[PDB]
Amino acid sequence: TELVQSSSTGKICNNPHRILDGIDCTLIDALLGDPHCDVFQNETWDLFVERSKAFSNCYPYDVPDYASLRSLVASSGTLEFITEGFTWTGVTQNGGSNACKRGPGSGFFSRLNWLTKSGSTYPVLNVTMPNNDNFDKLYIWGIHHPSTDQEQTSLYVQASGRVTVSTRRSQQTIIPNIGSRPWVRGLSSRISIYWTIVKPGDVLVINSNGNLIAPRGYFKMRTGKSSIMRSDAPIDTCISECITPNGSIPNDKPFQNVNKITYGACPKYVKQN
């Protein structure tokens, strides 16, 4: 009807909303620090645009709580990462894999620290990082699922690892699942990525006797009105307060049938054309 906006421009206008084009990178890969996503370090946005051509090129992983982490970071509108001086006594830091090339040689996620044995021992790591600031801290960490029992003992000595991450409120323990998954970039192992919000007056405690993928710091969290959107439409220097994955639309009509997902001041969605 004449009251329903049914057509789109097919392009996303970068005025007045600050658009960040993910290109080959998802927000989560930019968060983790996948080497080919290094350009997104400490970037900012009103709307992050994720492309269907985005890919990962680092250690093969899963994220048990992906959607919530993605939404929390997108709503924040920033990737500001603060390095903290963790002391990891008795282990080897900065592990690298050839499935995650950083230049000519092996590498890893830039925001994560792959810890392995030193000498012939992997001690029980026990560290505490308090939040004495006035903002929320987002910690990204993970656990390594080795492919075989031999890989487990070669890396962490202990035959069964454990990652325990706590605050003053509660404690979370993850046990690795040893086993051969389908081959990805030379590896049958996997990493599971987890995350923890630490609020002012709380503390972060990490305890592990093996398989910990350690944090290097925290993301400085903020309450914002930014968002994220999956779209293949090109970014254009035009003007539009309303953005859909199909592209920008005028917001003068009361209703629109272009897309359920919208960002900015937009007409209310209806199905009727």
């Epitope: 989560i28 985005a54 890919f55 899963d62 992906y66 998954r181 389908p182 081959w183 990805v184």
Partner: antibody, heavy 129, light 109 residues
Framework: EVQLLESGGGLVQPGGSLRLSCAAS????????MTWVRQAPGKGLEWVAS????????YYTDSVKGRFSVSRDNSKNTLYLQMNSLRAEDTAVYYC??????????????????????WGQGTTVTVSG | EIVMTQSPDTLSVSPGERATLSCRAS??????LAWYQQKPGQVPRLLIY???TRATGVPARFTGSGSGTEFTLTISSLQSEDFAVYYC??????????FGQGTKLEIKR
């Protein structure tokens, strides 16, 4: 609703080629591994090929290696199966199937292969002289 | 090559009676095992994953158990809709998927 719509099956001479298509809707396509399953007349289900969420990792059963090729266009939410040098033993109904998640909704496992959530309606290819 | 073997090939049981189907893996697949049901001229449908977890919408009379190399799927009381071919399947153990050869659940009379 999650839907998988298949097309491209048909009759082909031995040694011929066919391309199967699986158009997906109702879910975030690139988050899930997608795979091809075939069933010969009066026989059991057989895994053919699988593709990761990104498509950068592919796997094949031994009997189709070097002849079949799985791909996906994540901009079109479509899975493909290019079948070259077809043989009579390739006559079967071909299903595409979506991997389920493991941790529940809102999780992300594009490089793992879990119990199959949704199946296409099937497309028949017949290789004969 | 992990081999999934189902037994028996055909299981004959009266409507309303109990039925138990078995599936064995040539090596341990932990609990990465699913059961599917297929009627003639029909798409397969998921029944059990994780060896023992009923899929959404699957009636309570279906139950699975086992871990490692031996698995059982039990139907406590068969209804007309339950007579079909059942397939077990490993997933994510080095190869993405491997099916058992299937067991036909047939009406005994």
């Amino acid at each position: 609703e999650v839907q998988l719509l298949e097309s491209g099956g048909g009759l082909v001479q031995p040694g011929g080629s066919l391309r199967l298509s699986c158009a997906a809707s109702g879910f975030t396509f690139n988050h899930y591994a997608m795979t091809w399953v075939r069933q010969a007349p009066g026989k059991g289900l057989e895994w053919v090929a699988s593709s990761s969420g990104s498509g950068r990792s592919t796997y094949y059963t031994d009997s189709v290696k070097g002849r079949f090729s799985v791909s996906r266009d994540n901009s079109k939410n479509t899975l493909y199966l290019q079948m070259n040098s077809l043989r009579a033993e390739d006559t079967a109904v071909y299903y595409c199937a979506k991997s389920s998640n493991y941790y529940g909704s809102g999780s992300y496992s594009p490089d793992d292969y879990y119990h199959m959530d949704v199946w296409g309606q099937g497309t028949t290819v017949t290789v004969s002289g | 090559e992990i081999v999934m073997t189902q037994s028996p090939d055909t299981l004959s049981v009266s409507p309303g009676e109990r039925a138990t189907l078995s599936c064995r893996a040539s090596e341990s697949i932990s609990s990465n095992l699913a059961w599917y049901q297929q009627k003639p001229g029909q798409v397969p449908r998921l029944l059990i994953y994780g060896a023992s977890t009923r899929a959404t919408g699957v009636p309570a009379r279906f139950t699975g158990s086992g871990s490692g190399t031996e698995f059982t799927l039990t139907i406590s009381s068969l209804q007309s809709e339950d007579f079909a071919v059942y397939y077990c399947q490993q997933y994510n153990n080095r190869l993405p998927y491997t099916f058992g050869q299937g067991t036909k659940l047939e009406i005994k009379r």
